[PDB]
Amino acid sequence: MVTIRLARHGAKKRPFYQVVVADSRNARNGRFIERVGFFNPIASEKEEGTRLDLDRIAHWVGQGATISDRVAALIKEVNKAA
Amino acid sequence: ANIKSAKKRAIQSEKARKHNASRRSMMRTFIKKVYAAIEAGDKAAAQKAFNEMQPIVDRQAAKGLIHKNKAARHKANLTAQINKLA
Amino acid sequence: KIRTLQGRVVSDKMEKSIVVAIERFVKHPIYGKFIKRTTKLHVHDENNECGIGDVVEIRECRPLSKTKSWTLVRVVEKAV
Amino acid sequence: ARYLGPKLKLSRREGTDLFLKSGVRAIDTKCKIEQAPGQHGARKPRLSDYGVQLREKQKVRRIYGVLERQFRNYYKEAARLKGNTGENLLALLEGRLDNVVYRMGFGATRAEARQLVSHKAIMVNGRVVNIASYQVSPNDVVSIREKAKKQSRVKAALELAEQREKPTWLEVDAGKMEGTFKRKPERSDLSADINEHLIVELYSK
RNA sequence: AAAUUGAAGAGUUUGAUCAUGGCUCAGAUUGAACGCUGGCGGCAGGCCUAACACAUGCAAGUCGAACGGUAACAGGAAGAAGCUUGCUUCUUUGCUGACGAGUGGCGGACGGGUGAGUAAUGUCUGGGAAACUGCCUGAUGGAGGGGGAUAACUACUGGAAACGGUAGCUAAUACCGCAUAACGUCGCAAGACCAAAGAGGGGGACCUUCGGGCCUCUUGCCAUCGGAUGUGCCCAGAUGGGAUUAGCUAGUAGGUGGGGUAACGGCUCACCUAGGCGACGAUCCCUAGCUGGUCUGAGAGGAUGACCAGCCACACUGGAACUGAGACACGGUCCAGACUCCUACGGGAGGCAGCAGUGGGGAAUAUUGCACAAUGGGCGCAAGCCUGAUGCAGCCAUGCCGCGUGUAUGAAGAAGGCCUUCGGGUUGUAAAGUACUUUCAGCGGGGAGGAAGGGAGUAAAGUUAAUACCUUUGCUCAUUGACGUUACCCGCAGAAGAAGCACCGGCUAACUCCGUGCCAGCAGCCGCGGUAAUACGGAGGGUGCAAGCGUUAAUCGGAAUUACUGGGCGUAAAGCGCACGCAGGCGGUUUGUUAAGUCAGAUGUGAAAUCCCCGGGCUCAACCUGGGAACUGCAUCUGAUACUGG
Secondary structure (H helix, E strand, O other), X not given: OEOOEXXXXXXXXXXXXXXXXEEOOOOOOOOEEEEEEEEOOXXXXXXXXXXXXXXXXXXXXXXXXXXXXXHHXXXXXXXXXX | OOOHHHHHHHHHHHXXXXXXXXXXXXXXXXXHHHHHHHHHOOHHHHHHHHHHHHHHHHHHHXXXXXXXXXXXXXXXXXXXXXXXXX | OXXXXXXXXXXXXXXXXXXXXXXXXXXXOOOOOEEEEEXXXXXXXXXXXXXXXXXXXXXXXXXXXXXXXXXXXXXXXXXX | OOOOOOHXXXXXXXXXXXXXXXXXXXXXXXXXXXXXXOOOOOOOOOOOHHHHHHHHHHHHHHHHXXXXXXXXXXXXXXXXXXXXXXXXXXXXXXXXXXXXXXXXXXXXXXXXXHHHHHOOOEEEOOEEOOOOOOEOOXXXXXXXXXXXXXXXXXXXXXXXXXXXXXXXXXXXXOOOOEEEEOOOOOOOOOOOOOOOHHHHXXXXX
């Protein structure tokens, strides 16, 4: 099925996660359908560090896609503060 | 086979092969009877065979063993040829 | 609103079937000169109607044989 | 990663003052500045066109402390930028920390100022920077930290900065031991004995 | 606002000259290797050869909330009795916590590897019509009622093992009918025909064959039409070399009708027609996985396809199917073949181009490491279990980037070396000496972030016959890190522990002694060496790079030396011995029309990464990252009509 998940990138011990509407069979860093936002867990906290696209995630959940554990938490947390 | 899953799954598939083979042979045999009655030149024998074939191939589509569209080709193809006689 | 090529009719020995050269003027990639490069096509003609030499017009439908996926919309010029 | 040798062999090969000993003692007492270094110095050469381009690059390199692999990289950058590629290349050497230290006059030489920098005596904007090639920006403060106000080196060095010329592009505030790199220096602000067209010609063969 | 600012020559033919023209050099790059040398860290990279053969361990399971169940080890119960009245040793019991083997489900078609085959059942770009699609999702309805089996288990039994054979035994969401049936399929219509499966948590009443029924919530099951994803199929263009390969093709090319496929189709077959492809390179031979990209270049070009990402193909060699939403299946089946082992000689077993690793080949390429803590994946209501994917560590200067190996001062300028016109000169402020600093390494102390969640508790709202239960939302408490003795920060001691390699005739930056005597040797090209060698070998000095420096190999450059941009052909290489002439290329002048080329505008696409610009984050840098520009292309639509074409 179609999912919404984090692909890892970044250097070693300093990850960085793109957020990617994939088919679930494809490998983590491989073939995605869309990119939708990002997530930096090492961020400075004076300067962004997470940005989802809530308008295009809600579209893909419409058409009937899953979400991860993490991408769920990131949606909960980017609707509290913003 | 090394893996447990693979040993088992080879047994299951040899069971299903023997099963499916029987259901596939049956389903053909009823279809052969209609082509026998068509080659005789024989409208109401062939129409009687078509009505014994019909419920079998529609079921075998639902059970999985053929596809919906193979079922329909077999009906369409005979229905055409019995209407050329009568 | 259909994509529709034009051409002309370099055989018609086949039954319900013709062969139809499409010309086009391509710039050569290196040397800059515009060139006649030809594109032959087997085409479905119902009614055996189209003569050899005849200008014609054709569209892409489903596959009809091994070769043909192209069927004959209308004739333009002819008998020449 | 650093020239460890005799500093006045270098100054004789250029025929020039490269500022590599401070000026407690003046230059012409120590060495022989007119005569070139080693055994066959007093004999002139007809120095070729490649020669004079090489000789000029190695003057600039040996002032600022930089080695070739690193200098070549400054040159790539300087060309990448928009501007005269000579003027840009000298901006990027007057940006370097170990130099900016010395031009504010906490070091006596660039080799001293580089030992400050490496030994964690320098902050930039509060944070301890300890690498010589750090590129200072406009409106950064550089400043000494609190062990290293109590050194004899730094006080005696600030005496020697009053006898040299004043840089325009730094505001030093020498009682505190800090100062503000205000803007990038222009070509007019720097020494005009350095030909830069020779270096650029060199690499674009 | 910005998104490209870009182009060097020299040596060698001659007594000398100008020209032609080859050879050679100076640059960048690398999955490199070899030699000499070697302090630290960061980020990358690492069998290019034999798609050779492999010992050993691990790389795919999970589910008791589908089922019959007990062999384990946890309790509990009746109950032998430790009996010292409750501290429990030993006999039962599937009673419940669980759970080996078995049935059944879902997954083993993903993820991981490799590039042998494949010049087109491939790839890239753009179009299209005749298709299927488990898991996820929207809508619409259904879910009634019966049957016969068989693994396990039991009893006997064959075989050295692998693995089996008899006779009974029993279950389900296993399997099969019947009922049921439309917006489903067949049909012009009338009509004909097609399915299903239950399991869980709790419960106020009320009945019982004390099993449950019954109420309710969660969850699955079946059909139909949608959506999303994934896949299949077709067409046009583009996608290496060879003409000392020019004719190839009879299921061949088209038709009609049958059969086949999820689907169009010579896909297959019977009859009929005699076509189809080709100098715009068919056929045949050689080489090769394709692309995004990478290297080089001022650019146009040329070379390349390692890592990362997309597509293809293969899984000891060849052949074939089966199961299934999906395979003609790396860790499945059957067959043949070669190889390797076991055998009581009847027969059996295996497949690292998963991760480590061994041998072999080779100039040459690593540990039989830790962890699922994070991100993904499978199964599961969940807890959780699995995951050599992945995340980390190890080895190696293989590469890029950063830092270090001290700093300042110090003279008749010590010694020793070297040269000397024997005055002195040079090594050289170099050392010693005197002041100061302690980065990194070494020894101590502190210490972020990667962790989001899940659990145990309450609180409210929903839910409903119910304050049960379940779900959603907030609250409180105890927790989850492989790396790791982590990054980062502070303290201690003392210049302490840390510099080599190539070159010095010209091209090309850097020169003198002694040895040697066309010998030994050097050498990229010219050439050097035959007793005063700036060219050999050693010494002293110097130049250039610097934890690296050189040699070799390979690509582009320089090379306007295959010239589109951008060359030539009277004598330097180069005008067919001369004509005619088919395909081909090119075509005077004028008006109209068309709008193919051409130009302008708009939409769609041109994956992400890469490159370039403006920013941000690692102390800086490499490295990572936000936004843009670019992807010069292809298609569609609307205009323009000078030029070319019709």
